[PDB]
Amino acid sequence: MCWVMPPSVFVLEYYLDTLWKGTMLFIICLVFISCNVLREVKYQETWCFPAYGMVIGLWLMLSSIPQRRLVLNHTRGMYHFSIQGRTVCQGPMHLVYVRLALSSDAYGGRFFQLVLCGHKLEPLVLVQLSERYEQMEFLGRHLARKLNINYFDYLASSYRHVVRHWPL
Amino acid sequence: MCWVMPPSVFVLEYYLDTLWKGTMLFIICLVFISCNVLREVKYQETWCFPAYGMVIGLWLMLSSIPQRRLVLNHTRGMYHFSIQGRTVCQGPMHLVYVRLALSSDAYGGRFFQLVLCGHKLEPLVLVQLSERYEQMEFLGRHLARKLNINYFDYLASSYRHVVRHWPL
Amino acid sequence: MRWRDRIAVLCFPPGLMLTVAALILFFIHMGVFASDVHNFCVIHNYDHMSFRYTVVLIFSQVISIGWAAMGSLYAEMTGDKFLRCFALTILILNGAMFFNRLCLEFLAINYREER
Amino acid sequence: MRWRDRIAVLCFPPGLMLTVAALILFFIHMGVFASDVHNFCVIHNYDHMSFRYTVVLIFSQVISIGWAAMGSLYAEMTGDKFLRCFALTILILNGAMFFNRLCLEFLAINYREER
Numbered sequence A, B: 001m002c003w004v005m006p007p008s009v010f011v012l013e014y015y016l017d018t019l020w021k022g023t024m025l026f027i028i029c030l031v032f033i034s035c036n037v038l039r040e041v042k043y044q045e046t047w048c049f050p051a052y053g054m055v056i057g058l059w060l061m062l063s064s065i066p067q068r069r070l071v072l073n074h075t076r077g078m079y080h081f082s083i084q085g086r087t088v089c090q091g092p093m094h095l096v097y098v099r100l101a102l103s104s105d106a107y108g109g110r111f112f113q114l115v116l117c118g119h120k121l122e123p124l125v126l127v128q129l130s131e132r133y134e135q136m137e138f139l140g141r142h143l144a145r146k147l148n149i150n151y152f153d154y155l156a157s158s159y160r161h162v163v164r165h166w167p168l
Numbered sequence C, D: 001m002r003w004r005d006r007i008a009v010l011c012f013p014p015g016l017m018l019t020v021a022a023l024i025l026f027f028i029h030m031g032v033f034a035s036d037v038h039n040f041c042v043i044h045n046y047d048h049m050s051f052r053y054t055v056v057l058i059f060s061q062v063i064s065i066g067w068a069a070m071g072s073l074y075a076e077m078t079g080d081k082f083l084r085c086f087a088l089t090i091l092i093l094n095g096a097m098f099f100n101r102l103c104l105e106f107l108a109i110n111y112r113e114e115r
């Protein structure tokens, strides 16, 4: 899977995982429907917790999303924000970045994620492997080989990050 | 009133008369509340008619309006649509006109009204007197002496109407 | 514009609100229809069924129908298909619910009173 | 943008909707509060009071308080005073509402059951 994804021929497409959340909510509450705990001796009925489960799962399922795409076509594409049907965000460069983000806990453990920054864009969260830095900018160079725009790092400019298009 | 209003020093201000309708609806319902018709022999109760009247009157009363104004100040004013608080419509000329409109019934009787045309502007309906044509462009020339913009007539251009600013 | 400010005040944009009023009329009339059917089928509690408010909610029905129509007509010129689909769907559901309640009331006729 | 399209689909703009959900929680909870005081004051039909659902609607209360707070926090950065005033007013009314129902439940404590 290391090779196949980086070339990302022309456009890339993207989706969301909230449909998974809605599906597991529906499954769990459907389990909750039939033969729940019998706590009439507790002088109460707990059906409204799964009723709020109905409400939450039905809303989370309603967040449908067709294939979030851009004009990342390996050309002079404007990186206009594209959705099947409607279009919202347009911009001549200078907005679509790729940035490394860091998070820390009370102990101090560092977790690293990636985000394709822009006007209401989609992130680049890698698949559940962030303890070390590994190579960092090699995938950034591969994105550059795609359609070079930026490869931003943490904090300010300083060093250790590369820019390609600038608005001055 | 003929020499008071057409001079209209600098700005003009304007309001709506829907508050009159709301107040009349409130008065009618308050009459309807105490000692209405006793039609229990009709096997029905008609409190929902004044209830719907209250819904309508409360909604119409909510149409508040601070003094609809423009930049009709006797200068190079932009005629920017002005409201105490928010502002919406802005345009460089070519939109604020004054137009004569006509209405007819089945018999063929003609009624003449006037409208200050523009993006969501207010009209210039005269005080309940439209049977004869009288003077037409005399009040139009007075508006021209104010801040000459247009004085449009019915139908197409043809003749009998004057323009002052054009966008070509 | 600032829908924000649109929803701000003094009043509001064109029609719209007048269209979504038919929606909440549909909500309350659907609730009343459901209560009527529920009391007709199982509980059999004709004492508290809506035999008493008969013509006033029919007048509410008809003004809601006219309101949804007038909203559709006054909102069609925006040139956008979604608003027209919204208004036409509301008109269709209101007409269907009106005809359904008319059939229900014409059916349960031997249960109110006699003249 | 096309609020139009914003309200169009796939989902919706940021938060907002999550703030107006607290509004309709306030609607239903003020409704049951009104029913509760009405049954406490005149009709006296404790068999059908809200004696039976007591902890689940309290959990709904606290989740609505948290929702309104989180919506205010998630909508404050729009830079517009009207949205902040909106969200803060809903938070204040929900909080006073919650304290009111807490006080009323703590008052009617001799009418439920006993351990």
Ligand SMILES: CC(C)CCC[C@@H](C)[C@H]1CC[C@H]2[C@@H]3CC=C4C[C@@H](O)CC[C@]4(C)[C@H]3CC[C@]12C
Residues within 6 Å of the ligand: B048, B051, B052, B055, C028, C032, C047, C048, C049, C050, C053, C057, C060
């Ligand atoms: C006034 C405009 C907005 C129309 C709304 C009509 C409302 C106010 C009317 C229409 C339907 C009505 C209800 C229909 C059925 C019931 C149950 C019945 O056993 C007693 C009357 C009662 C409780 C009515 C109360 C008032 C009611 C809710």
Ligand SMILES: CC(C)CCC[C@@H](C)[C@H]1CC[C@H]2[C@@H]3CC=C4C[C@@H](O)CC[C@]4(C)[C@H]3CC[C@]12C
Residues within 6 Å of the ligand: A048, A051, A052, A055, D028, D032, D047, D048, D049, D050, D053, D057, D060
């Ligand atoms: C599920 C989430 C959205 C919370 C909504 C809570 C709803 C489902 C709860 C809270 C208030 C509840 C009502 C409160 C009072 C009454 C009257 C009582 O004599 C029987 C129960 C009954 C009829 C309850 C039915 C369920 C109810 C409407």
